[PDB]
Amino acid sequence: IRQFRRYGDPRYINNEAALIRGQWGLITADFGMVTQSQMENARLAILRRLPRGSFTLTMHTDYEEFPVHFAFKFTTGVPLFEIMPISARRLNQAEAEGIFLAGRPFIPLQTVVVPQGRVDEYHVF
Amino acid sequence: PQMVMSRDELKLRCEYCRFEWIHDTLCVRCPAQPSHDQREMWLHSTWMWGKQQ
Amino acid sequence: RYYALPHLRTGPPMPTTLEQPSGEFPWGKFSTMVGGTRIHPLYRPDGFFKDNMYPA
Amino acid sequence: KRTGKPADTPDYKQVYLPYDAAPTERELERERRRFKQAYHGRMEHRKLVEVKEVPLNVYTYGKEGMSLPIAIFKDQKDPVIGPEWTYPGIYENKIAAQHWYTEELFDKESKEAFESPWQQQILDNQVKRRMAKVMFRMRQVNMKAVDLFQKERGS
Amino acid sequence: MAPELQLEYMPVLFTRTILGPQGGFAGEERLVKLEVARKYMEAGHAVTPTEELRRGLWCYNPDTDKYDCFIERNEEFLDFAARKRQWLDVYWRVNTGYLLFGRQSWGQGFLINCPLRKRDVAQKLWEQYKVRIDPRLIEFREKDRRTGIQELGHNWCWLYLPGAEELGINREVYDNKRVKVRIHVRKMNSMFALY
Amino acid sequence: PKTVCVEPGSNRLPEALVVEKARDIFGRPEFPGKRVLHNWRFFIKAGKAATGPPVGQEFSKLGLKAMDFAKVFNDRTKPHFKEDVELIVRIQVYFDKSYLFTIEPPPTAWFILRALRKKRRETGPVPLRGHYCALMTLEMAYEIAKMKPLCWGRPEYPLLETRVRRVVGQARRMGVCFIGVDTPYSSPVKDMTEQQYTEECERYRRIHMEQYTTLRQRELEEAPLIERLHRPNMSPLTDEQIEEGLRDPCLLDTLWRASHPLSPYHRDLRERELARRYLNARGWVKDMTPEEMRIVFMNYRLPEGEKRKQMDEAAMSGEVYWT
Amino acid sequence: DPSAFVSDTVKLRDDKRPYWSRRRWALTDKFLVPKSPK
Ligand SMILES: [Zn+2]
């Protein structure tokens, strides 16, 4: 409540390499602040490119909102979206990245597409 | 022609589309359907030092 | 307190049976022909409609 | 498509009885009740699905004495389904003609255990189907750039 | 005892194998903070170390997901646990820690006029984290191999922790061979900087 | 009470009449050797070939009078055929604008929808719906697959046990449920105990294995000679061995020479032993007796008979260029 | 022997993208969007 300009500073690089439960995931590569509306735009743009018969888009919104207006302060490596399978459909990297490519522009900071399991942050970074 | 930000953002959209060099600037020309033409954005073909950095 | 690694009593320095999966997307070098394929010109593949239709 | 589809559907004719011992109708129910549920997929995603058009008689459905309505010529009599062992490799197919997920065949080959000798060939043809999928786009990407999944899907 | 004086931290035996800097693997006695000890113990992942629990314990394998892995703590288990802990202690000391670094910068873009190398990354480790490692285990990023580190701000580097498959280290760390060593280089004037 | 042919696995072809008239009507006009400018396919009913929209349009598209093909097709197809059987007609048009059409039995979709007693749009892919369409035994699949050969000249090829899977898998793909397969058990037999069924199975399957084996043996004997030559296995090669073997030619051809049947020409110990030791210089497969090299490396899709023939020094000792 | 797994190999010239080949051009595609820090 009534937090100062220096609070929840995203600028540090985190030690937590996230674990993405979904088959694919979209992960924050830099520091920044993201508006909710931007993530909604991203979500809709991604849902345009998904085969809704085999797939479900999971958005991680549970992070704190910080006053500016309320937005998110994102550290490197924080997961955003998850492509979760309802069936045996196994995407390639080109396909998954082609899917997240729609929603990348709306997000103001750089993002990486990461495959199922734990982020291998030697390869990502 | 539309100017792409860099060489990576440059794709061949059609069957007849080609990579060509405009004086050290890499570009894409289609003899059919000219709306497919892409330039890499870079310095003018003629530039001096004070005039262009 | 100072912190230091234990010695090696048994087994290899880099985990062999315990390998983490490597995090790249596993595209075979020969399955996607891009680079790192050093193939002798005698052994050149996939010419089936060009020169490997008239073999040997 | 409405092309190459039968515009009529003749019936089955049961020529000879496969058995001489007639079943009680409770046997005809207890076998049928066994049939209505089946398994789909063979892997971690594996789901029981209820089967539509489960026949009244299980004992007499496909296994002998029934004449199929697949006849074509004028003098073609409806083919009578013969005994099982006179049909070649049927017991061998029952083992191997099933959905085989790639991962799973592979692990069998590594452990050097195959349910049938043929599952080698089942594997080799799967790989070739996958790599063909790779080989096609690489003839298509050559002629023109084709970008995977950037277009809006549906309407 | 008292509501005022509360134990800074209390000893705990572990049942699960827990990921974080506080959590341990199954079977080892570690003393961790109150608020973490209660949230581990009430969730059944940790027990109070009574003596017969120091001799043997019912832990679990994640496959069966029931506490059926019985480990009895004998001598050859306790040296194993000692080594395992003093491995992942170095693991959770270094990435959790963020090594503050400061130096002098002249010129226009944000470069250090005395670039870093592997002998003084390993130095800062000992200076503020008291971590002693052979400096030849460190490897830089691809961009920083050629010039050294040399740029202001947030940089990361990689530390290779060699031996663990002996300790069965998997899934309780982020990866078995590596730690992201996080450097931050701040420019300071001639008063406060070195070199 | 009657059971027609009780014999171990000779129900393979259909009966005589169907075979021979399917020979003289479904048939191959020989390829003249011209440049094909159109390969056309149609589904046309038996008694009726029409000058209506599809065939008339595509023949008038070339300027060809479509009445002739229609008349010839009706003269050839109206007799011998039961009604409402839609046939595959493949017309091949050459650069002389002269054509040759083949008449082929109906598509597999047609047979499956006949045999399942199902009309059109009554069946689909399973995840699209979430329930199987009609049950089918593998007995029925054979009498579907019997009808489609590769070449009516030779009905035996390709072999049923293989090509049946095409039918099974296409039916699969249609959403058909199955018995032999995709359910644990086989449709109940009234008169026999389960152990009797299974004991029957374990002898019958190996009888069929033997028959299939000899069948593809004389299959391979009809073939040209180069398939009876040596293509060694690459899988037993340690993958770095394969790629470094692709980096230089000598590893692979010395390998080929080393693992080869002992035939008069290639059986030479002098050129073999130094070949083996030349391979073993570089860490190639070293735990090998040469005679187990001849086992580990051999053509694997080559059938059992001629491969034991090649393994055997005696049977292959006889093939020698005379003069 | 630390240097067996530790890689110091300084890559002098950065490897470029094959515009002289049509298939390798699109197969080497990098799906990436340039973003300046805000
Ligand atoms: Zn174009």
F288 contacts: CB under 8 Å, gap ≥ 6 = F276, F296
- What is the CA(B18)–ligand 1 centre distance, in A? 9
Residues E168, A111: Cα–Cα separation, whole Å: 33
CA F193 to the chain's CA centroid: 36
C38 contacts: CB under 8 Å, gap ≥ 6 = F246, F247
With beta carbons less than 8 A apart as the criterion, state whether F159 and F215 touch. yes
Among candidate residues F182, F79, F176, the one with its CA nearest the CA of residue F136: F176
To 5 degrees, how large is the angle CA F262–CA F263–CA F269?
Answer: 55
Q: Is D133 helix (H, G, I), strand (E, B) or coil?
A: helix
Residue E23 is encoded by which pair of tokens?
């959590």
Q: Is E27 helix (H, G, I), strand (E, B) or coil?
A: coil
Residue F45 is encoded by which pair of tokens?
């009913």
Write the single-letter amino acid at C36.
G
Residues A85, A56: Cα–Cα separation, whole Å: 6
Nearest CA in chain G to B13: G26
Pairing of strands B38-40, B2-4: parallel
With beta carbons less than 8 A apart as the criterion, state whether E176 and C18 touch. yes
CA D57 to the chain's CA centroid: 20
Residues F137, D62: Cα–Cα separation, whole Å: 6
DSSP F14-79: --HHHHHHHHHSS--PPP----EEEEEEEEEESS---SSHHHHHHHHTTT--THHHHHHHHHHHST
Q: Identify the DSSP state of E7.
A: -
- What is the CA(B31)–ligand 1 centre distance, in A? 8
D32 contacts: CB under 8 Å, gap ≥ 6 = D54, D55, D56, D58
Mutate to test the interface with B, among G23, G25, G36 (most CBs of B within 10 A): G25
Q: How far is CA D23 from CA D14, D66, F70, G14, in A?
A: 16, 17, 54, 79
Q: How far is CA E195 from CA C49, E186, E190, in A?
A: 66, 14, 9
Among candidate residues G25, B14, B20, B15, the one with its CA nearest the CA of residue B29: B20
Q: Does C13 touch chain G (CB under 8 A)?
A: yes
With beta carbons less than 8 A apart as the criterion, state whether B2 and B39 touch. yes
With beta carbons less than 8 A apart as the criterion, state whether D95 and F178 touch. no
Nearest CA in chain C to D130: C31
Helix/strand/coil percentages in chain C, nearest 5? 0, 5, 95
Q: Do D148 and A49 touch (CB under 8 A)?
A: no
CA A118 to the chain's CA centroid: 14
Pairing of strands A66-67, A70-74: antiparallel
Residues G11, E113: Cα–Cα separation, whole Å: 22
- What is the CA(C27)–ligand 1 centre distance, in A? 30
- What is the CA(D70)–ligand 1 centre distance, in A? 52
Residue A101 is encoded by which pair of tokens?
């490519």
Q: Does D47 touch chain A (CB under 8 A)?
A: no
Pairing of strands B38-40, C3-4: unpaired
Residues E52, E58: Cα–Cα separation, whole Å: 11
Residue E33 is encoded by which pair of tokens?
């903070």
E160 contacts: CB under 8 Å, gap ≥ 6 = E137, E138, E139, E177, E178, G2, G5, G6
Sign of CA dihedral F60, F62, F63, F65: negative
Residue G1 is encoded by which pair of tokens?
């022997």
Q: Identify the DSSP state of F87.
A: E
In this structure, the number of other CB atoms found within 10 A of the CB of residue F293 comes to 20
B16 contacts: CB under 8 Å, gap ≥ 6 = B30, B31, B32, B33
Among candidate residues E105, E103, E104, E159, the one with its CA nearest the CA of residue E129: E159
Residue F188 is encoded by which pair of tokens?
């109940």
Q: Chain F partners of C39 at a C-beta cutoff of 8 Å?
A: 246-247
- What is the CA(B24)–ligand 1 centre distance, in A? 21
Q: Chain D partners of A99 at a C-beta cutoff of 8 Å?
A: 149
DSSP F105-119: PPPHHHHHHHHTT--
Among candidate residues E157, B42, E60, G25, the one with its CA nearest the CA of residue D144: G25
Residues D17, D65: Cα–Cα separation, whole Å: 6
- What is the CA(B36)–ligand 1 centre distance, in A? 4
With beta carbons less than 8 A apart as the criterion, state whether C20 and C14 touch. no
Write the single-letter amino acid at D56.
L
Residues F235, F232: Cα–Cα separation, whole Å: 9
Tell me the β-bridge partners of E111: E151
Q: How far is CA A53 from CA A49, A58, A85, F128, F289, in A?
A: 12, 15, 9, 8, 56
F68 contacts: CB under 8 Å, gap ≥ 6 = none
Nearest CA in chain E to A76: E154
With beta carbons less than 8 A apart as the criterion, state whether F89 and F44 touch. yes
Residues F173, A20: Cα–Cα separation, whole Å: 33
- Directed axis angle between helix F269-281 and helix F249-258, to 10°? 140
* Phi, psi (deg, nearest 5) at residue E11: -70, 145
Q: Is F90 helix (H, G, I), strand (E, B) or coil?
A: strand
Residues A40, F44: Cα–Cα separation, whole Å: 54
Q: Identify the DSSP state of D62.
A: S
Residues E18, E26: Cα–Cα separation, whole Å: 8
Is the pair C, B in contact (3+ CB pairs within 8 Å)? no
Residues F27, D15: Cα–Cα separation, whole Å: 32
Note which residues in 134-153 of chain D have CB less than 8 A from chain B: 143-145, 147
Residues F220, F227: Cα–Cα separation, whole Å: 8
Residue D133 is encoded by which pair of tokens?
């999928």
Residue F76 is encoded by which pair of tokens?
């050839």
In this structure, the number of other CB atoms found within 10 A of the CB of residue E154 comes to 16
With beta carbons less than 8 A apart as the criterion, state whether D21 and F191 touch. yes
F151 contacts: CB under 8 Å, gap ≥ 6 = F28, F157
Of E86, E132, E164, the CB nearest to C15: E164
Residues F125, F130: Cα–Cα separation, whole Å: 8
Residue F19 is encoded by which pair of tokens?
């075979």
CA F144 to the chain's CA centroid: 15
Is the pair G, B in contact (3+ CB pairs within 8 Å)? yes
Residues D111, D119: Cα–Cα separation, whole Å: 13
Does B23 show up as a binding residue in the annotation?
A: no
With beta carbons less than 8 A apart as the criterion, state whether D73 and F107 touch. no
With beta carbons less than 8 A apart as the criterion, state whether F146 and F16 touch. no
Q: How far is CA D67 from CA D80, F17, F306, in A?
A: 4, 17, 40
Q: Chain E partners of C9 at a C-beta cutoff of 8 Å?
A: 83, 166
Residue E180 is encoded by which pair of tokens?
């992201």
Does B36 show up as a binding residue in the annotation?
A: yes
Q: How far is D30 from chain G (nearest CA, A)?
A: 57
With beta carbons less than 8 A apart as the criterion, state whether D92 and F201 touch. no
With beta carbons less than 8 A apart as the criterion, state whether F197 and F189 touch. yes
In this structure, the number of other CB atoms found within 10 A of the CB of residue D90 comes to 27
On the 0-12 / 13-18 / 19+ scale of CB atoms within 10 A, F208 is buried
With beta carbons less than 8 A apart as the criterion, state whether F5 and D86 touch. yes
Classify each residue of G5-21 as buried b or exposed e, where b means 16 or more C-beta atoms within 10 Å of its C-beta.
Answer: eeeeeeeeeeeeeeeee
Is the pair A, B in contact (3+ CB pairs within 8 Å)? no
With beta carbons less than 8 A apart as the criterion, state whether E101 and E187 touch. no
Q: Is E186 helix (H, G, I), strand (E, B) or coil?
A: strand
Mutate to test the interface with D, among F77, F120, F146, F147 (most CBs of D within 10 A): F120
H or E element, residue E142: helix E142-147
DSSP F182-219: SSSS----TTS-HHHHHHHHHHHHHHHHHHHHHHHHHH
With beta carbons less than 8 A apart as the criterion, state whether F261 and F230 touch. yes
Among candidate residues A117, A119, A19, A35, the one with its CA nearest the CA of residue A74: A35
Residues F300, A113: Cα–Cα separation, whole Å: 42
Q: Does E136 touch chain G (CB under 8 A)?
A: yes
Residues G9, E155: Cα–Cα separation, whole Å: 19
On the 0-12 / 13-18 / 19+ scale of CB atoms within 10 A, F230 is middle
* Phi, psi (deg, nearest 5) at residue B37: -65, 130
D102 contacts: CB under 8 Å, gap ≥ 6 = D123, D126, D127, D130
Residue G24 is encoded by which pair of tokens?
């390798």
- What is the CA(B35)–ligand 1 centre distance, in A? 7
Maximum separation of any 2 CA atoms in chain E, in Å = 67
With beta carbons less than 8 A apart as the criterion, state whether F178 and F138 touch. yes
Q: Is F83 helix (H, G, I), strand (E, B) or coil?
A: coil
Residues D120, D96: Cα–Cα separation, whole Å: 10
Residue F82 is encoded by which pair of tokens?
């039961």
Q: How far is A54 from chain E (nearest CA, A)?
A: 28
Q: Chain G partners of C19 at a C-beta cutoff of 8 Å?
A: none
Q: Do D147 and A98 touch (CB under 8 A)?
A: yes
What is the SS3 string spanning chain D?
CCCCCCCCCCCCEECCCCCCCCCCHHHHHHHHHHHCEEEECCCCCCEEEEECCCCCCCCCCCCCCEECCCCCECCCCCCECCCHHHCCCHHHHHHHCCCCCHHHHHHHHHHCCCCCCCHHHHHHHHHHHHHHHHHHHHHHHHHCCCCCCCCCCCC
Q: How far is CA E76 from CA E24, E60, E79, E81, in A?
A: 18, 20, 6, 9
Sign of CA dihedral A64, A70, A76, A80: positive
Residue E35 is encoded by which pair of tokens?
């608020």
Q: Does G13 touch chain D (CB under 8 A)?
A: no
Residues F19, D72: Cα–Cα separation, whole Å: 12
What is the SS3 string spanning chain A?
CCCCCCCCCCCCCCCCCCEEEEEEEEEECCCEEEEHHHHHHHHHHHHHCCCCCCEEEEECCCCCCEECCEEEEECCCCEEEEEEECCCCCCCHHHHHHHHCCCCCCCCCCEEEEEEEECCHHHHC
With beta carbons less than 8 A apart as the criterion, state whether A64 and A3 touch. no
With beta carbons less than 8 A apart as the criterion, state whether A22 and A58 touch. yes
* Helices and strands (H, E) in chain G, number of each type: 1, 0
Write the single-letter amino acid at F83.
E
Residues B18, B33: Cα–Cα separation, whole Å: 12
Q: Do F201 and D31 touch (CB under 8 A)?
A: no
Residues G1, D127: Cα–Cα separation, whole Å: 40
Q: Scanning the structure block, which residue is given the tokens 């093909």? A: F69
Residue A80 is encoded by which pair of tokens?
């955003």
Note which residues in 1-56 of chain C have CB less than 8 A from chain A: 20-25, 27
Q: Provide Rg for chain A, Cα atoms.
A: 15
- What is the CA(B17)–ligand 1 centre distance, in A? 5
Q: How far is CA E87 from CA D93, E12, E30, E145, in A?
A: 54, 19, 14, 27
CA atoms within 13 A on the CB side of E52: 0
In this structure, the number of other CB atoms found within 10 A of the CB of residue D153 comes to 12
Q: How far is G24 from chain D (nearest CA, A)?
A: 8
Q: Identify the DSSP state of D154.
A: -
Write the single-letter amino acid at D67.
S
* Phi, psi (deg, nearest 5) at residue F8: -70, 80
A6 contacts: CB under 8 Å, gap ≥ 6 = none
With beta carbons less than 8 A apart as the criterion, state whether D43 and F123 touch. no
Q: Does A101 touch chain G (CB under 8 A)?
A: yes
Residue D23: cis peptide before it, omega within 30 degrees of 0: no
* Phi, psi (deg, nearest 5) at residue D27: -70, -35
Residue A10: cis peptide before it, omega within 30 degrees of 0: no
Tell me the β-bridge partners of E160: E178
Resolution in A: 3.4
Tell me the β-bridge partners of F90: F41, F102
Sheet holding E29-33, edge to edge: E29-33, E9-14, E46-47
* Phi, psi (deg, nearest 5) at residue E183: -100, 140
With beta carbons less than 8 A apart as the criterion, state whether D54 and D78 touch. no
In this structure, the number of other CB atoms found within 10 A of the CB of residue F104 comes to 15
Q: How far is E139 from chain G (nearest CA, A)?
A: 6
Of A13, A16, A120, the CB nearest to E156: A13
Q: Is E75 helix (H, G, I), strand (E, B) or coil?
A: helix
H or E element, residue E30: strand E29-33
Q: Do E83 and C6 touch (CB under 8 A)?
A: yes
Residues A29, A20: Cα–Cα separation, whole Å: 15
Write the single-letter amino acid at E183.
I
